[PDB]
């Protein structure tokens, strides 16, 4: 059907040259020569080979709404009536004054342009509207974004544990401002990369890698072409915690009893928990840290309708503690 | 800097064309057809050539046996035409009674080469560039692609038509190729040479130089023989036109064309180029935006089409003015005045039939008063005249309003002319000259600007040459930069270089880019003279 799927000139000339389906100026719709009156000798327009500029380009919305001033951001622009070749849209895209270089592979003709923003350090403006010029910045052939792209310089000031075990695996909470900017994010503690989870305006949450040597470590966050640092905010790697004694050396099938556990560096894990493997089932339960040496834990349930512990007593297949990535304690 | 170049290793070159999407350059030659990159690296080479054949033979040896002796002869590319619609290249040769080739666009794969039927034969003529034409298309399923093509005939009146309207099928293997748009036993979409006119004037022939599609028509600039000027051969350069939608061929018109410079006649076309004028020339030539213009090149007199004179003149025609001369001539014959006046076609002069009609520019010819000629020769506006080195070729383009003209020379040189008759100046002035094949290899008519319009591919007998439209970096000083006047050049003040607006970083800002000599950097020092014996003297600088 001549479009029930395309109410934009760019979408029609985009489809098969086979269909014969083409865009008809006057109607503001698209159908064959057959179905559209020739009031002008050039009233029905078809993409001859694609050498057909298309009128009234419009931008619907664009992703990343914010970006770093340094640039490198991949801008993801989605419109309706854009150009039909890449080599016309290339050079057309700009973010206010800032030159934006578009990407070939990621470009979907007259629906979507993926564009890489250049250096915006020299720009006076904090925010600017996005512009596409189809081939020539002609007065009818220009589109301007409905809302504007914002430049920021993200900053960070605090980390929400500042300490963690050498093996790593700590849930880190970096606080700051403008942290959600741009496209890619990479967090590096001691040069070694943090496993990213989620991003926010105010927070970055990631899981720490293993440290080389215990003590203070630099935190480097790079967003696209912007590399932000803070030597006042450091991360302190601690010697791996140890488990020495559990006091009562027992519990019942449903668990839930107090266990007075003793060891070292226990304050360096925020959420430690007990693990126990009974039969083919693995089960876990909570702990409350008091000192660096003392901890109270609630014993794990092993309730299995397949096996019940005997009156004499029985050792589990495995018993240990989940403390970040210190796996020798598992 | 060095000029990017492609050398013809073994043979002469004949035609060049640029693909509007890719910038790939296709090059017709004797025995060869090349595909080249934008910077003129060889991409693919097709052998089309040395074929065992003989010009005297009708249908060539392939179809019928000929008693005439055969020999290995060269196949000259007569024509070359980009068919973007069917992703290919029409590569029309000679030396097989003029059979046409189809090469695939991106690899030169021979898709087809029809040569069974009589229409698949175009002309015996072995001369390069005496042929031209245009490809015109509609969408698939509708009225299909057509080729309008003129060629010389060599006296083979009954074998070939000089001008024709032919069919272009989607299958290259399809036998219907180069068949006439509408054939009847009475009238076919073709125009033949009458036998009576060849008996009277022995070797009359029509040589087609340039050709272009405009709005809804098809024009041709032609050379013909002495028919009211047996004796000797003297040529008359004329314009031809047809409606694109005229299967009957009734729209044919034919006006003589030339121009005069201080009592010196220039009547032989060497090349032409249809273009725009841009805001500048348009305004003071009195035109609308989309109104077209035709730059041309003529040699002096009406002598020796085979080897013309050095004396050559670049003229100008506005198409609105040629359209008015044709409308004026038709609204005249439809008043019943005089005869049709077309010597070579109609030997006995038929008369103009009066009739009441709305004579428009949309008029596509009618049954009576038929194919007709022209009495008043159409005069062109002269621009530049070379007297020591003959012009050979031309192109032009719109740059930021100002109209730049390109002109090949017999020497292998290109001129870069701002046409300034409509501009403030006294007459259109040469800006710059450039070198291609310095030794004296002439430039050929096929001279095309790139798609990005950054370069201009200049073809010779023996080499293609990528000549940049803009090369302002040869200018060392603000004072010389803006002094050359060739309009692409500005002084990028803070970089102290001469180049275009889009090349000077931050040019849009105040005073960062200079375009008139008055914007040039002017500097003065207060203590101009300081003694060797002095040290660390305070100086004040006004800029
Ligand atoms: C960091 O914090 C933690 C606590 O949060 C802390 O660990 C405890 O520290 C406190 C002192 O601050 C100690 O408590 C003292 O115990 C004295 C007597 O010890 C006997 O009783 C112990 C408690 O019995 C309770 O728990 C058991 C088992 O869970 C339970 O059955 C009972 O019902 C009862 O609730 C008992 O654990 C202990 O057994 C220990 O010793 C044996 C043998 O050596 C060993 O094998 C075991 O492993 C076990 O460790 C023993 O039988 C008691 O006198 C004292 O009372 C004084 O202080 C209070 C308050 O200040 C005054 O009011 C009062 O007047 C007394 O002067 C106090 O109750 C406790 O021993 C620690 N726990 C452990 C496991 O060692 C760390 O020390 C803190 N770190 C610091 C301070 O830096
Ligand atoms: C990064 O993280 C590491 C590890 O967590 C930090 O190092 C620790 O610093 C804390 C500070 O809170 C230390 O606790 C204090 O200890 C001092 C005295 O330290 C001495 O005694 C230690 C315990 O007995 C002992 O481990 C130390 O020996 C280490 O160092 C030597 C030499 O380098 C090495 O060879 C050993 O192997 C040890 O590693 C050392 O001799 C003490 O003054 C403090 O007491 C205060 O608090 C108590 C109780 O509240 C109070 O009673 C006192 O009055 C006093 O106010 C406190 O206990 C901890 O010992 C260190 N741990 C380790 C493993 O080194 C490091 O500081 C962090 N870096 C940064 C930049 O912050
Ligand atoms: C070497 O480098 C120095 C740079 O300092 C150049 O010196 C300048 O030369 C030009 C002429 O060559 C001078 O312009 C002329 O100015 C006079 C007015 O002069 C008065 O005002 C001056 C500035 O306000 C001031 O310096 C003068 O005072 C000097 O003289 C006294 C007394 O001798 C001395 O004590 C001081 O130390 C000063 O040196 C003075 O009060 C003006 O009258 C001139 O115009 C006349 O000429 C023109 C052209 O013919 C004509 O059209 C007019 O009608 C008119 O008759 C002229 O403008 C300039 O003042 C000098 N600058 C300084 C700082 O003295 C010098 O040119 C360089 N030498 C060479 C050889 O190139
Ligand atoms: C088995 O039977 C089938 C089907 O019956 C045959 O297939 C047909 O093959 C013939 C060839 O003989 C095809 O005929 C061709 O049709 C073209 C018509 O296209 C036009 O149609 C309309 C109306 O005319 C136009 O409006 C429209 O714009 C199209 O242009 C003709 O143009 C062809 O003519 C050309 O070739 C012939 C022969 O070489 C010349 O005489 C002509 O001058 C001209 O150059 C051609 O006639 C036909 O399309 C096929 N049929 C169908 C239904 O599609 C098989 O031939 C047969 N097979 C065997 C093995 O016996
Ligand atoms: C085929 O033709 C194409 C063009 O038609 C051509 O490829 C182009 O080469 C030019 C340089 O000749 C390149 O332009 C560059 O763009 C980058 C930005 O991505 C700039 O960094 C470059 O600047 C450098 O060069 C300047 C001038 O010399 C220096 O002043 C400066 O310091 C930099 O060193 C430069 O502007 C461009 O990459 C391509 N064009 C495209 C569209 O990719 C090539 O010559 C031909 N190739 C072949 C194989 O024949």
Numbering used by the authors:
A (entry chain A): 806 to 1135
B (entry chain A): 37 to 265, 271 to 584
Sentences from the paper on this structure:
We determined crystal structures of the full extracellular segments of mouse PlxnA1, PlxnA2, and PlxnA4 from eight crystal forms providing a total of 13 independent structures that range in maximum resolution from 4 to 10 Å. The 4 Å dataset was obtained by dehydrating crystals of PlxnA11-10 that diffracted otherwise at best to 6 Å resolution (see Experimental Procedures). In the crystal structure of PlxnA1-full ectodomain, the sema domain (domain 1, “head”) together with domains 2–9 (“stalk”) lie in a 230 Å long curve that forms a ring-like conformation. All consecutive domains are arranged in a beads-on-a-string-like fashion, with short interdomain linkers (up to two residues) and extensive interfaces (buried surface area ranging from 716 to 1,172 Å2), each interdomain interface having a small hydrophobic core. The ring is closed only in the 4 Å structure of PlxnA11-10, by interactions between the sema domain and domain IPT5 (domain 9). This relative compaction can, most likely, be attributed to the dehydration procedure applied to generate this crystal form. The membrane proximal domain IPT6 (domain 10) is positioned perpendicular to the ring formed by domains 1 to 9, and the IPT6 C terminus points away from the plane of the ring. All our PlxnA full ectodomain crystal structures have an intermolecular plexin–plexin interface in common. This interface is formed by blades 1–3 of the sema domain of one plexin molecule and the outer side of domains 4-5 (PSI2-IPT2) from the ring of a second plexin. In the 4 Å PlxnA11-10 structure, the interface has a buried surface area of 1,303 Å2 (355 Å2 between sema–PSI2 and 1,008 Å2 between sema–IPT2) and a complementary electrostatic charge distribution.
Class A plexins (PlxnAs) act as semaphorin receptors and control diverse aspects of nervous system development and plasticity, ranging from axon guidance and neuron migration to synaptic organization. Plexins are large type 1 transmembrane proteins comprising typically ten domains in their extracellular segment, a single membrane spanning region that is predicted to be helical and a conserved, cytoplasmic region that contains a GTPase-activating protein (GAP) domain with a Rho GTPase-binding domain insert. All our PlxnA ectodomain structures show autoinhibitory, intermolecular “head-to-stalk” (domain 1 to domain 4-5) interactions, which are confirmed by biophysical assays, live cell fluorescence microscopy, and cell-based and neuronal growth cone collapse assays. This work reveals a 2-fold role of the PlxnA ectodomains: imposing a pre-signaling autoinhibitory separation for the cytoplasmic domains via intermolecular head-to-stalk interactions and supporting dimerization-based PlxnA activation upon ligand binding.
